[PDB]
Amino acid sequence: GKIVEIHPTTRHEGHTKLVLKVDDEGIVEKGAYLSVTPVRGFEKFLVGKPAEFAPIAVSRFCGICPVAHATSAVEAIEDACDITPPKDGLLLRELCGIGNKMHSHPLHQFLISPDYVPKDDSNEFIKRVQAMRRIGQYIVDAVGGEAIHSPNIKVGGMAKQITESTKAKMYYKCKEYEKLAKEQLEYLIPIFESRTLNDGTELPEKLGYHDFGYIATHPTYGDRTKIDQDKVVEYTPFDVYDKDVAIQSSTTVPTYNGRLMEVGPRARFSKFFDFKEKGAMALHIARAYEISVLVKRAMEILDELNVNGKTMSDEPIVGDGEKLGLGVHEAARGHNTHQAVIDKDGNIVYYNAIVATTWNIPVISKAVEGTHYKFAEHIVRAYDPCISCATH
């Protein structure tokens, strides 16, 4: 018996804490991973504000994946107002969200690189990551209007059209990204399969195992019809932590059908590519494998896109003040939900968000259990935690 507390945990986004009941041997028997970041309360100060302000504001949840929140926001508002964005606006919107994920996944492999990438390979490894992030940020900047916080993501579609020249330049930039990805995959997959860090430490085989399911609505975008929100229920931290730790959690405890559920790249690969490998390493592997799916999808969007087609709908932003619109999007880190009720004037009556990591935090608490505590942070980082997102 002994208690181990790691605070703050490192090399991910945000501010969290680990609380680990451990035995005399280092093995964690009860785990608790929780956010302690101060809550800004976006959803609550959006009440009364016009609908158009929502994607602007929720984008500031997080600067690593702001596109994920602007997308879910406009999808929820559109659903509440029965607005249908045009063919080409919806294509541009998905292309924007892909470009953002094309920069987050290589970014995450850069954050974990101190553990797995040898010292002599570091500079070459980082140059490759930055070369990939450059292309991903180029896509968000050209389609979304800004690389960090995109103003073109609006209720109705996408605000601006790209030129035939920007489209061609993007396509050949994606071909470059695809070559960088095959080079990066070739390099990382063997290391994750080795289960050995760069200092020689062999990680346990069952590192990160948990008995929870997955949620994912789409391999690259999102589909509100692949989930029944009525079955999503947010519980309090007292349902998963002890009392003295539960009063420290800044997030809620989201469930589906009455159980915790993991979201992210492994969830998607489980639902669409039959990837059923458990553990921490398998998460890293799914995220690496996904880089290829993203860039291929982007080039397929460029082939179908008509740069002259309508991108913004003319339908007005009015609601009935009652319907609970639903907007889901597969953020880099997983299924991301926003909800909105819009009145006849186009103002926000009610707003709520259930962010990706928020699903993952209570799973991580149970996933660190069973292994030595000096492996806990390696399990945490496998989930690519974004705490500003989880807390908002």
């Binding site: 002994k2 208690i3 181990v4 507390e5 790691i6 605070h7 703050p8 945990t9 490192t10 090399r11 991910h12 986004e13 945000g14 501010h15 451990v22 302690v36 970041t37 101060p38 809550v39 800004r40 309360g41 959803e43 609550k44 100060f45 504000k49 016009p50 158009e52 302000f53 602007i56 504001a57 500031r60 949840f61 997080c62 600067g63 690593i64 702001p66 970014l107 954050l111 101190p114 500079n123 980082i126 140059k127 930055q130 070369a131 992030r133 450059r134 940020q137 209007g145 800004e146 690389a147 960090i148 916080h149 103003p151 309090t236 931290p237 959690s249 800044s250 997030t251 809620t252 500003s388």
Partner: protein, 240 residues
């Protein structure tokens, strides 16, 4: 040169904008030594073991020469305020990075009412509690504007940084800064560059004057920083 990235109630967008220097970032990271950044390094780890507990803490190191502080401070959170006074004491130059830290930014709209910390509702820029030496507006400020700050700070280009040092004394930002200080004072000539600077597209040129859509402004302060009728240092007139 010891550099540190301190993260308070922000979103990491300003850090990502620093990362969007790509090739210049490798240059920048070998000229200075990043001693603290919870998102990037494992510093500074300190362990304290009793008979019942093992406390592995990551504290802010000392000797910090330049500290890029991102985000605002939550007055109802003890850790948040402990860390903003900490960064000031342990750093010689404190840079308010981004609108959240420099002027409040989007967190000005925080009013609370949301679990799970229902009491969190009061957010202020770091300048309201500690001394700020340089301030970068924007949400986020561009990577190019970032490398210029970092280069000038290392080259002692005090003439270039004067506009941001003066900006560190002011803790309030809004789109009405264009009206109060330019339109109302008979200084606006209608160039339109303030509209081109806005990240949310909240400014609209009508009748040759900027028109701020108030419900879209996030109080980032990029437009008032850009206006050449507010500040126009002579160093800009020097071109090759």
């Amino acid at each position: 040169v010891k550099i540190a990235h301190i993260h308070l109630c922000g979103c990491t967008g300003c850090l990502i904008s620093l990362a969007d220097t790509y090739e210049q970032l490798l240059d920048i990271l070998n000229s200075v030594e990043l001693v603290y950044a919870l998102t990037l390094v494992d510093e500074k780890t300190e362990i304290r073991e009793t008979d019942d507990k093992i406390l592995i803490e990551r504290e802010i190191p000392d000797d910090i020469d330049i500290a890029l502080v991102e985000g605002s401070v939550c007055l109802e959170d003890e850790h948040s305020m402990k860390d903003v006074f900490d960064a000031r004491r342990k750093s010689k130059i404190v840079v308010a990075l981004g609108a959240c830290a420099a002027t409040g930014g989007i967190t000005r709209f925080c009013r609370g009412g949301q679990m799970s910390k229902p009491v969190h509702s009061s957010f202020v820029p770091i300048g309201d509690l500690i001394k700020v030496d340089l301030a970068l507006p924007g949400c986020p400020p561009s990577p190019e504007a970032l490398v210029n700050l970092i280069t000038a700070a290392l080259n002692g280009d005090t003439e270039y940084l004067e506009i941001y040092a003066e900006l560190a004394k002011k803790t309030e930002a809004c789109g009405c800064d264009l009206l109060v200080n330019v339109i109302n004072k008979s200084l606006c000539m209608g160039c339109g560059s303030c509209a081109a600077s806005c990240p949310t597209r909240a400014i609209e040129m009508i009748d040759g004057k900027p028109n701020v859509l108030k419900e879209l402004c996030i109080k980032c302060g990029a437009c008032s920083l850009q206006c050449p009728r507010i500040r126009f240092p002579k160093l800009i007139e020097e071109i090759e």
